[PDB]
Amino acid sequence: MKNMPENHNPQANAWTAEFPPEMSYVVFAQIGIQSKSLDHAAEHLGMMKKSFDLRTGPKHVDRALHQGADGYQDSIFLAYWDEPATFKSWVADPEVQKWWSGKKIDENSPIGYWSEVTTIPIDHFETLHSGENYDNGVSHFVPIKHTEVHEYWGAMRDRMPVSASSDLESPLGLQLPEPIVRESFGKRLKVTAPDNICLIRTAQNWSKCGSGERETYIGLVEPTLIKANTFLRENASETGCISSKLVYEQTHDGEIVDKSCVIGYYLSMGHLERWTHDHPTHKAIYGTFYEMLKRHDFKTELALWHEVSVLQSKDIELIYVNCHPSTGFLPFFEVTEI
Ligand code: HEM
């Protein structure tokens, strides 16, 4: 590990995914229905829900709700496979093909469709968990193990196997170009990303907190998490953050549960590192979590985790049908009409 300090002894425990040898990829698919009122999205969401129960459906799927720009909401499925061939057979299923790639989105539709499908090579992937929790993304179906490789700047990079042999820099260098405003409503658009973009899903789960911890999380952490995500959304070029969403997770039936996450894409892992290590909003929430840890013998019922991947252009498929121009990758890079 390159960045680990001498005689490193972390204050808090943490766990990390330990992938079996036969696993080569994780498919992480984000599929969204975009609307101004959730009633408009009900029909699509019903169809997609049933598709996930196919024999080729994902090993795990979360539902979440995103409040986007200017009154648009995204109803999102976060779906995981451990076998790309199974994912491809799922997409090919006639029931999935009824709605895949926004097929039902007609002209002048009140809803949009988008999908961001990432096929993650395992050597370009790492996870971290504040507890031995088997309901955190891939930990629903991958074992996890205790690790010392955390609680220092650069630990995320060190946990990703390929960082020992690659700097993981963008071919575009250090500056994300100014966003542009696409005429994206009424169109079917595919965006091509540059190599070595970095995707993070970083999650907060207060479902097991008693009153004390819950009041602290809601009163003292979440407001600054909201501030952090807003800053990332509004300052793409300064930060290198292509896209950031704060989403609240839901039951199968759509009810909001006590879980959230930020899903963000960055021009490179280095951009994500520099924001995390430097910005005051992450400074503030990091400090509060360690304040909670000390007050609870370094075992809070609040659970945090993240999944971080570094992606090649060919690893990610980005499709936006009748979407608001601020959605996802639409402001950046190369676009084509499908
Ligand atoms: C916009 C939302 C967030 C982003 C993008 C983000 C990003 C990151 C990244 C990339 C790291 C790894 C740093 C490294 O290893 O170099 C990290 C570490 C950490 N973050 Fe966050 N984070 C976010 C929200 C939060 C929240 C809400 C909390 C607490 C409630 C939090 C607490 C921590 C802690 C405690 C660590 C240290 C983990 C360890 O290595 O043991 N973060 N964060």
CB neighbours (10 Å) of residue 65? 16
Q: Bin 151: left if φ > 0, else alpha if -120 < ψ < 50, else beta.
A: left
**How far is it, in rounded angstroms, from Cα 259 to Cα 78?**
14
Ligand 1 lined by 105 (C-beta under 6 Å): no
Residues 312 and 168: beta-carbon distance below 8 Å: no
Ligand 1 centroid vs 276 CA: distance in angstroms?
Answer: 7
Angle at 43 (CA atoms; ends 40, 49), nearest 5 degrees: 125
Ligand 1 lined by 285 (C-beta under 6 Å): yes
Ligand 1 centroid vs 138 CA: distance in angstroms?
Answer: 18
Q: How far from chain centre, in Å, is Cα 151?
A: 21
Nearest to 14 by CA among 125, 126, 130: 130
Cβ partners under 8 Å of residue 280, min gap 6 = none
Question: Which structure tokens are listed for 335?
Answer: 């676009």
* Number of residues written out for the chain: 338
**How far is it, in rounded angstroms, from Cα 27 to Cα 30?**
10
Method: X-ray
Q: Which residues pair with residue 196 across a beta bridge? A: none
SS3 for the chain, per residue? CCCCCCCCCCCCCCEEECCCCCCCEEEEEEEEEEECCHHHHHHHHHHHHHHCCCCCCCCEEEEEEEECHHHCEEEEEEEEECCHHHHHHHHCCHHHHCCHHHCCCCCCCCCEEEEEEEEEEHHHEEEEECCCCCCCHHHHCCCEEECCCCCCCCHHHHHCHHHHCCCCCCCCCCCCCCCCCCCCCCCEEEEECCCCEEEEEEEEECCCCCHHHHHHHHHHHHHHHHHHHHHHHHCHHHHCEEEEEEEEEECCCCCEEEEEEEEEEECCHHHHHHHHHHCHHHHHHHHHHHHHHHCCCCCCCCEEEEEEEEECHHHEEEEEECCCCCCCCCCCCEEEEC
Residues 90 and 70: beta-carbon distance below 8 Å: no
Q: How far from chain centre, in Å, is Cα 154?
A: 20
Question: Which structure tokens are listed for 209?
Answer: 């907190």
Nearest to 267 by CA among 197, 164, 203, 216: 197
Ligand 1 lined by 96 (C-beta under 6 Å): no
**How far is it, in rounded angstroms, from Cα 102 to Cα 275?**
34
Amino acid identity at 61:
V
- Decide: residue 121, CB within 10 A, 0-12 exposed, 13-18 middle, 19+ buried: middle
Amino acid identity at 125:
F
Ligand 1 lined by 309 (C-beta under 6 Å): no
Q: How far from chain centre, in Å, is Cα 143?
A: 20
Cβ partners under 8 Å of residue 222, min gap 6 = 204, 260
CB neighbours (10 Å) of residue 299? 11
- Decide: residue 86, CB within 10 A, 0-12 exposed, 13-18 middle, 19+ buried: middle
- Decide: residue 201, CB within 10 A, 0-12 exposed, 13-18 middle, 19+ buried: buried
Mutation choice for ligand 1 from 8, 127, 198, 202, CB with most ligand atoms inside 8 A: 202
Residues 262 and 200: beta-carbon distance below 8 Å: yes
Sign of dihedral through CA atoms 24, 147, 205, 278? Answer: negative
Mutation choice for ligand 1 from 285, 295, 301, CB with most ligand atoms inside 8 A: 285
